[PDB]
Amino acid sequence: SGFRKMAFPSGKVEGCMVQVTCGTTTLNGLWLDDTVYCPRHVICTAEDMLNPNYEDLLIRKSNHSFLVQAGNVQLRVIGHSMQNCLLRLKVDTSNPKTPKYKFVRIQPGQTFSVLACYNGSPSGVYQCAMRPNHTIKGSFLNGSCGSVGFNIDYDCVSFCYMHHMELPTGVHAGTDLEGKFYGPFVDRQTAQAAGTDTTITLNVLAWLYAAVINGDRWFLNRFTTTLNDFNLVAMKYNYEPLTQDHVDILGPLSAQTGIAVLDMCAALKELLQNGMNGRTILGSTILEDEFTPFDVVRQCSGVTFQ
Amino acid sequence: SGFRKMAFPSGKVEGCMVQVTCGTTTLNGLWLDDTVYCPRHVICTAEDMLNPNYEDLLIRKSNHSFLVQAGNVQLRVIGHSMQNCLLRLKVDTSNPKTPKYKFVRIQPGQTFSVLACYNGSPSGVYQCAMRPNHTIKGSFLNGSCGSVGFNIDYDCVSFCYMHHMELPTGVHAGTDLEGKFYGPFVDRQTAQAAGTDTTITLNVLAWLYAAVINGDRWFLNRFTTTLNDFNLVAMKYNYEPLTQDHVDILGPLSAQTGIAVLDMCAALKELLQNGMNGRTILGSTILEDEFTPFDVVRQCSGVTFQ
Ligand SMILES: *[C@](O)(C(=O)NCc1ccccc1)[C@H](C[C@@H]1CCNC1=O)NC(=O)[C@H](CC1CC1)NC(=O)/C=C/c1ccccc1
Ligand SMILES: *[C@](O)(C(=O)NCc1ccccc1)[C@H](C[C@@H]1CCNC1=O)NC(=O)[C@H](CC1CC1)NC(=O)/C=C/c1ccccc1
Secondary structure (H helix, E strand, O other), X not given: OOOOOOEOOOHHHHOOEEEEEEOOEXXXXXXXXXXXXXXXXXXXXXXXXXXXXXXXXXXXXXXHHOEEEEOOEEEOEEEEEEEXXXXXXXXXXXXXXXXXXXXXXXXXXXXXXXXXXXXXXXXXXXXXXXXOOOOEOOOOOOOOOOOEEXXXXXXXXXXXXXXXXXXXXXXXXXXXXXXXXXXXXXXXXXXXXXXXXXXXXXXHHHHHXXXXXXXXXOOOOOOOOOHXXXXXXXXXXXXXXOOHHHHHHOHHHHHHHOOXXXXXXXXXXXXXXXXXXXXXXXXXXXXXXXXXXXXXXHHOOOOOOO | OOOOOOEOOOHHHHOOEEEEEEOOEEEEEEEEOOEEEEEHHHHOOHHXXXXXXXXXXXXXXXXXXXXXXXXXXXXXXXXXXXXXXXXXEEEOOOOOOOOEEEEOOOOOOOEEEEEEEEOOEEEEEEEEEOOOOOOEOOOOOOOOOOOEEEEEEOOEEEEEEEEEEEOOOOOEEEEOOOOOEOOOOOOOOOOOOOOOOOEOHXXXXXXXXXXXXXXXXXXOOOOOOOHHXXXXXXXXXXXXXXXXXXXXHOHHHHHHHOOOHHHHHHHHHHHHHHOOOOOOEOOEOXXXXXXXXXXXXXXXXXXXXX
């Protein structure tokens, strides 16, 4: 038993991190087969950043404008193109540690593990959720650009995030592995603000099911609710509206616990209206929204402590 | 910026996990050079566990009583001995992925990363602290025995924990890599209870320094306190007494922020006495005690957001 924000084991990703330098700018890149992926702003200098024209800035570089280092070893660049907000650098050597992989664009509310990296050297690993406002609450310092997010399913690594920027509120923004930003953000050193955020309702509910699987029932009640009545309370507490598709996703957890979804919604509504009255759930005093239903099934026992 | 419970990158440890089977019992083991380490209860059957005599149970096995699997590959055992609560199995092949390593016994209040493992296959990674009562708040299911805890410093892995049991309250207990238990616990399927726990004072203070490094000052105040006056309030809130050595450990953080330790103690005392008044610190509504001063220096910027 127990319940923790767990990340995926990071080994397969560690063996793909490199350093990419252009001029005075060093950041991290990702070496799969004979391509290295990195944020396109590696080509920029201080001056360029308020208002860069990347097409203009890039045509002025050659292959040898880029230095790629994998550990001790210099990799020779032999090709370069820009794909949305990344560069793809062709190199002379195929990464022998390339895992089986794919690139996915993850959806708001989904979770992934981040491998924080500095100078191509992995520093730490942690789990986070893509927020509804398309940011992540990471932990990232100067040098972290190019750090990747990922999920692992059955020895296949699904890359989903590359790091690019920190916003004024201290949260983080970046792209998928085709270089398309998550959210309305752009890679310029300008003023941009996160949109207003909301609590991820589906995940809160999934975590309450986890608390029940792990043997705690205190917050349950004898009521039920309709969706719609649930949703009027949700809006007032800045929770995402729940939908029938979300109700259906909770099926498996519902069956493992014998608690119908709308019954767990009445439980949630009562917690939003009355507080937790100094009690905890899975050790927390707050309602947690950074575990998906999938995260719950993966970590919790397949048998309820009834 | 940002602040997260971060674990060490897990790659070096992943390449050392194996499966160890004896009779009907399968659990995980740790393969360094030509030794495999595992919990000694792998030799036990259901029957044996209420009251095992391991010396008696072990003399009745041979080398071939043990099956070791590294991925697809069977490793041949050629030697066996018991060291406290572990077995050391000599094998015919030296692990080619053996990292640079050491074995340490960690102290109460220190932190490490756990690589949760099932059937020799790594499943997840998370950070936790050795509690003052010598337990950890892990997340561990059937099959997790043999999962290891570790720290990484400068490409050297310091193993410090191997997993053995879950207590009735849902927290976890095990040994260092010489097989000595943390705490008063024994490897028998009997009734044992965690001793009463306390909050780790030094870590709470270190995390308040992190909140200041990251630019938040709201909880500060104009007071100071003596140690002793601090400690009378500590005892009443089930906090560990603070000592002069702990005050000295906080030196570097104190200097980076310009906040004297006893001034941060007055801040803490005021938070214990008055609450947080619906406010948060580093995103939390609770006082966090699972970051050491070292964890703070490692993750936070070396320059304060003043
Ligand atoms: C990455 O570019 C990065 O790490 N680059 C390498 C590097 C940077 C600085 C010194 C040495 C090496 C930056 C990562 C940021 C920095 C702080 N934490 C992070 O996550 N990214 C940026 O600096 C980024 C570049 C922009 C093109 C996209 N800009 C910002 O993060 C801007 C922040 C900002 C601007 C204005 C007001 C408030 C915040
Ligand atoms: C490990 O032994 C383990 O994983 N073994 C492999 C295995 C076990 C069961 C099925 C299939 C494979 C156990 C890990 C525990 C199980 C639940 N979560 C864990 O952390 N450890 C034990 O079962 C352990 C063995 C004892 C010799 C030390 N016992 C306990 O954990 C006992 C718990 C208990 C007993 C009585 C009351 C309440 C709790």
